[PDB]
From a paper:
To better understand the function of the accessory domains we determined the crystal structure of CasDinG from P. aeruginosa strain 83 at 2.95 Å resolution with an Rwork/Rfree of (18.5 / 21.5) in space group P 65. We solved the structure by molecular replacement using an AlphaFold2 model of N-terminally truncated CasDinG. The CasDinG structure reveals a SF2 helicase core of two RecA-like helicase domains (HD1 and HD2) and two accessory domains inserted within HD1 (vFe/S and arch domain). An N-terminal domain of 103 amino acids was not observed in the electron density. The alignment revealed that the HD domains of CasDinG are in a wider, or ‘extra open’, conformation than the HD domains of the binary E. coli DinG structure. The extra open conformation may be a crystallographic artifact, or the result of having no ssDNA bound in the CasDinG structure. The first insert (residues 195–275) consists of a four alpha-helix bundle that aligns with the E. coli DinG FeS cluster domain with an RMSD of 2.3 Å using the Coot Secondary Structure Matching tool. Despite this conserved topology, CasDinG lacks three of the four cysteines observed in E. coli DinG that coordinate the FeS cluster, and no FeS cluster is observed in the electron density of the CasDinG structure. In CasDinG, the lack of a stabilizing FeS cluster is compensated for by a salt bridge formed between residues R204 and D269. Notably, analysis of CasDinG crystal packing suggests that the vFeS position that sterically blocks ssDNA binding is likely a crystallographic artifact, indicating a conformational rearrangement of the domain that allows for ssDNA would likely be allowed in solution.
Numbering used by the authors: 104 to 230, 235 to 309, 323 to 726
The structure:
């Protein structure tokens, strides 16, 4: 209550010592790893840290996704020092998508939910924000919640987009309200795009040196960086756009694109393997094609092209050049198995970019509920974010008793090992049907693939009917979340066969009871069908496993698993929470299942 940080009285009691340690280690120039349980009030802690740093005179940047950005703004504006120093939102173009190209892609890939969201105006899905300029639509994060495999490289809002575009107009209207404030709030994608732009030089305007950086939900940061260095070449819309231009240079570009298509099919059939990402040296059939594809793309004149063709051809050239850089790993999707022709080029190492970020950062604090793999072991996270080992500071985690006290772990499990077989599907569906018959509220059932989900759906559909919500490629995660909330509100007890984002991001606390968490029954039964092994399909995870062995696989599996468990208790004061783990390998007496058996032992069984 004296000689304290701004807004520290609003920070919950449990996070105050962690707050003090983070403040100290950050002012000393260290990259702090502060893991705190969800529902403890991490937003107030972030607000107090940013306020203490901004009062000192530092340039403070808080990088957080837009979902939590609203509540972060609310928690920061409550601090008077923050309101005095100023708080702005650096909403650069990489935050927004192009409605035209996103709608076209959704149509070409038969993603009805994404098409409907674009047609409806791209309105915010989760979010509210009323005193920060206008309403934020066309957000990349919502689009990703509607299509996890969104080729964001080729669907982002560019400066070459027409002025009458809604996303462009929203960006310009937001940029007009941008002032030089003490605290700048950005997204993970904004921070990563800014770092990449700053490196490629040696509207995007972040401080060239971040005195104090505060990353919230830091377990997403790397993925953001990974997305910013991904390049996508979508051949069908590019070919269509070129078909809609003057014939002076149309024929050569179209013939070069068809040559590239044929060479991509050749390389695809050259070695099927298992969706393997190969360098350009392993598929030389694309080297001339790609080269030709670039030349013709620059040959046709801009005197006659609209802004749409301009941005499309520029993005295509950037992608084809990043493919021919040799520093990338390629993934081909063509006629044999993918109706939508596409060439992906990613970076299996983000070390230079993240090091450029940390070199331009005086001090930093990373906040999340899943920073450590076990205890305070942030080694996997440090490696992912490429934090210099001398600057990393693994503070103790904060996970109170209420995060597991209302939870009762059940002894029942599916005896047949998860082998993607119809027999496993039958047994696991019998188990899920039992859990659904006993369940008092909404039931979430996490799966590891679309195939397991389809089998479990074919079983549980005839049994449940009104209650079942099957996630798929067409049925996004957001539409399933909305169906879940609606069916729970109607009195039905829904059973959501979820995957993907259902493991990592969704907030299943009933917002109809913000002051009475004792009556929260929105998610009463969490069910884990499989240990999430092999769910990370990033190039950096491929390199990390190739270097460190099966320990990286096991640590990523435990990280994903603890995230999935973190969907059940989202706040204190809840009750009647049930946890189910059906993977027979847990109770199999193996060696690699020892980490998981730790967390599950931490609960109380019944």
């Amino acid at each position: 209550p004296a000689d304290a940080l701004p807004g520290e009285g609003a920070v919950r009691e449990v996070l105050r010592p962690l707050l003090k340690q983070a403040a100290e280690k950050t002012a000393a120039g260290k990259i702090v790893f502060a893991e705190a349980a969800t529902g403890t009030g991490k937003g107030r802690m972030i607000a107090s840290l940013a306020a203490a740093a901004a009062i000192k005179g530092d340039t403070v940047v808080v990088s957080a996704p837009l979902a939590v950005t609203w509540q972060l703004v609310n928690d920061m504006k409550d601090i008077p020092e923050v309101r005095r120093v100023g708080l702005t939102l650096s909403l650069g173009r990489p935050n927004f998508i192009s409605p035209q190209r996103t709608l076209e892609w959704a149509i070409d890939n038969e993603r009805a939910d994404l098409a409907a969201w674009i047609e409806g105006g791209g309105k915010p899905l989760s979010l509210t924000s009323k005193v920060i300029s206008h309403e934020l639509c066309w957000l990349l994060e919502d689009a990703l919640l509607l299509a996890e495999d969104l080729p964001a490289d080729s669907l982002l809002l560019t400066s070459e987009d027409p002025a009458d575009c809604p996303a462009q107009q929203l960006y310009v209207a937001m940029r007009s309200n941008y002032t030089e404030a003490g605290i700048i709030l950005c997204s993970h994608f904004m921070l990563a795009a800014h770092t990449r732009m700053m490196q490629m030089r040696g509207g995007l305007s972040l401080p060239h040196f971040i005195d104090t950086l505060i990353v919230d939900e830091a377990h997403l940061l790397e993925q953001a960086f990974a997305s910013v260095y991904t390049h996508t070449l979508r051949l069908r819309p590019l070919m269509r756009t070129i078909e809609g231009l003057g014939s002076r240079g149309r024929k050569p570009a179209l013939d070069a694109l068809k040559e590239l298509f044929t060479q991509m099919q050749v390389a695809s059939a050259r070695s099927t393997n298992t969706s393997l990402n190969v360098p350009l040296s392993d598929v030389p059939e694309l080297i001339p094609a790609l080269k030709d594809t670039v030349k013709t793309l620059g040959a046709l004149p801009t005197k006659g092209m609209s802004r749409d063709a301009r941005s499309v051809i520029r993005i295509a050239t950037r992608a084809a050049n990043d493919a021919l850089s040799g520093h990338s790993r390629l993934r081909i999707e063509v006629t044999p198995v993918h109706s939508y022709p596409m060439l992906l080029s990613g970076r299996s190492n983000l070390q230079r970019a993240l090091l450029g970020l940390w070199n331009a950062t005086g001090g930093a604090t990373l906040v999340s509920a899943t920073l450590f793999t076990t205890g305070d072991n942030g080694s996997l996270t440090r490696w992912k974010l490429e934090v210099p080992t001398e600057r990393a500071a693994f503070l103790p985690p904060v996970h109170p008793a209420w995060t597991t006290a209302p939870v009762l772990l059940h002894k029942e499990f599916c005896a047949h090992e998860p082998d993607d077989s119809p027999e496993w599907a039958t047994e696991c569906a019998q188990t899920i049907q039992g859990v659904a018959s006993t369940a008092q509220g909404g039931t979430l059932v996490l799966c590891t693939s679309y195939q397991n989900t389809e089998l479990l759906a074919g079983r549980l559909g005839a049994a449940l009917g009104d209650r079942l919500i099957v996630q798929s490629k067409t049925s996004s995660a957001a539409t399933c979340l909305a169906q879940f909330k609606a069916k729970h509100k109607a009195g039905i007890r829904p059973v959501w066969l979820g995957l993907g984002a259902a493991w990592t991001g969704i907030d299943l606390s009933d917002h109809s009871l913000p002051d009475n968490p004792e009556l929260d029954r929105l998610l009463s039964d969490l069910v884990i069908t499989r240990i999430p092994v092999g769910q990370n399909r990033s190039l950096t995870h491929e390199r990390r496993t190739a270097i460190g062995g099966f320990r990286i696989i096991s640590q990523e599996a435990a990280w994903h698993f603890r995230q999935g468990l973190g969907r059940l208790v989202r706040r204190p004061g809840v009750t009647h929470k049930n946890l189910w783990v059906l993977d027979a390998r847990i109770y199999g007496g193996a060696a690699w299942v020892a980490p998981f058996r730790q967390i599950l032992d931490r609960y109380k069984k019944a």
